[PDB]
Structure formats: C-alpha cells, structure tokens
Design an enzyme around this catalytic site. Structure first.
Site, PDB file in Angstrom:
ATOM      1  N   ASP A 185     -64.282 -38.688 -29.994  1.00  0.00           N
ATOM      2  CA  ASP A 185     -64.180 -38.015 -28.443  1.00  0.00           C
ATOM      3  C   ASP A 185     -63.552 -39.576 -28.098  1.00  0.00           C
ATOM      4  O   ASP A 185     -63.793 -40.361 -27.626  1.00  0.00           O
ATOM      5  CB  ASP A 185     -65.270 -37.962 -27.982  1.00  0.00           C
ATOM      6  CG  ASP A 185     -65.902 -36.381 -28.804  1.00  0.00           C
ATOM      7  OD1 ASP A 185     -65.315 -35.871 -29.035  1.00  0.00           O
ATOM      8  OD2 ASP A 185     -67.176 -36.317 -27.942  1.00  0.00           O
ATOM      9  N   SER A 228     -64.955 -37.584 -36.739  1.00  0.00           N
ATOM     10  CA  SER A 228     -63.872 -37.195 -35.589  1.00  0.00           C
ATOM     11  C   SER A 228     -64.663 -38.506 -33.901  1.00  0.00           C
ATOM     12  O   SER A 228     -65.538 -39.173 -34.751  1.00  0.00           O
ATOM     13  CB  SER A 228     -64.269 -36.216 -35.249  1.00  0.00           C
ATOM     14  OG  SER A 228     -65.218 -35.634 -34.096  1.00  0.00           O
ATOM     15  N   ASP A 268     -68.963 -35.914 -37.640  1.00  0.00           N
ATOM     16  CA  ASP A 268     -68.134 -35.498 -38.541  1.00  0.00           C
ATOM     17  C   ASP A 268     -66.996 -36.600 -38.565  1.00  0.00           C
ATOM     18  O   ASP A 268     -65.999 -35.756 -39.781  1.00  0.00           O
ATOM     19  CB  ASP A 268     -67.362 -34.328 -38.155  1.00  0.00           C
ATOM     20  CG  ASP A 268     -66.552 -34.372 -36.952  1.00  0.00           C
ATOM     21  OD1 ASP A 268     -66.510 -35.479 -36.543  1.00  0.00           O
ATOM     22  OD2 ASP A 268     -66.621 -33.493 -36.061  1.00  0.00           O
ATOM     23  N   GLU A 320     -69.803 -36.780 -19.620  1.00  0.00           N
ATOM     24  CA  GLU A 320     -69.114 -37.307 -20.914  1.00  0.00           C
ATOM     25  C   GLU A 320     -68.641 -38.822 -21.170  1.00  0.00           C
ATOM     26  O   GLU A 320     -69.175 -39.685 -22.054  1.00  0.00           O
ATOM     27  CB  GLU A 320     -67.868 -36.672 -21.450  1.00  0.00           C
ATOM     28  CG  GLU A 320     -67.934 -35.055 -21.203  1.00  0.00           C
ATOM     29  CD  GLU A 320     -68.547 -34.581 -22.298  1.00  0.00           C
ATOM     30  OE1 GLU A 320     -69.215 -35.563 -23.404  1.00  0.00           O
ATOM     31  OE2 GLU A 320     -68.485 -33.567 -23.123  1.00  0.00           O
TER      32      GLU A 320
END
Ligand SMILES: [Cl-]
Ligand SMILES: [Cl-]
Ligand code: NA
EC number: 3.2.1.17
Length: 129
Positions: A52, A50, A48, A35
């Site tokens: 992370d 958003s 979208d 990640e």
C-alpha cells in the site's frame, strides 16, 4: 511530505474529492489520517505481499505498478512510486477510480473500521476551506 490536517483538506478539495461519489471531504481526510498519518511517503506491506502506497495507501495488487506483486493489475496506470510524491494529484485521481469501483470507500479498511459512521466532519472542523 507530512501534510497538516487542514492543508490536506484544501488540496483534497482543490483536487475535487469533496463529496466525490457522495463522500464529504471529512471522510477523505479521516481515511488519510488513519491510512497514512498524512504522510505521502507512507508504505506498508500487506499479507498477500502486495504493498500500500501514499497518503491513501493505494494497493499494488490492483491499482499501481511496483514490479513485485505477481498476478497484480495496474488499473490506475502509474508506478506505485508516483503515489509517494509531495503532490497528491496521482493519489487523488487514483482514489477516484477506486471509490467508483462499486464498494465505495469501504475499499479503505481504515476508513470502514475507523471513520465510517463516526463524526467525520470533525476532521475538517476549523479549516479555512
Ligand atoms: Cl508487479
Ligand atoms: Cl457509496
Ligand atoms: Na500492480
């Protein structure tokens, strides 16, 4: 901060993530690796709109507030910026709420596509835990 692999396993364990909701420590380290490459400052915009944040790339649509993700929630009740800190406390506590949400670690796309079903203990192999 860019954690060392065993240094991250230790902080994760101290913070109670080892076998949290049945997920051995290697699964968490493996997920952080893919990640964020163990970088607490990692940020990545999603399609979208958003974003992370942090070592575990926790998403602003549902978990933290960043002020720029319309219609989103802040289920961990924290600024997304707190997930970028050198200390992983906020990210761990929040990951614990996410993983308890019903789909387990499948909530982390990188864990499902790169860790799930692989030899994840390899990630804590050699570490003094
Ligand atoms: Cl927002
Ligand atoms: Cl599960
Ligand atoms: Na949010």
């Amino acid at each position: 901060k860019v954690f060392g692999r065993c240094e991250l396993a230790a902080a994760m364990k101290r913070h109670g993530l080892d076998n949290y909701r049945g997920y051995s420590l290697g699964n968490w380290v493996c997920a952080a690796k893919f990640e964020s490459n163990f970088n607490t400052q990692a940020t990545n915009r999603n399609t979208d709109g958003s974003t992370d944040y942090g070592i575990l790339q926790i998403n602003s649509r549902w978990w933290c507030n960043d002020g720029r993700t319309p219609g989103s929630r802040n289920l961990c009740n924290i600024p997304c910026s707190a997930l970028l800190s050198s200390d992983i406390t906020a990210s761990v506590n929040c990951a614990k709420k996410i993983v308890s949400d019903g789909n387990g670690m499948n909530a982390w796309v990188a864990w499902r596509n790169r860790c799930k079903g692989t030899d994840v203990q390899a990630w804590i192999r050699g570490c003094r835990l």
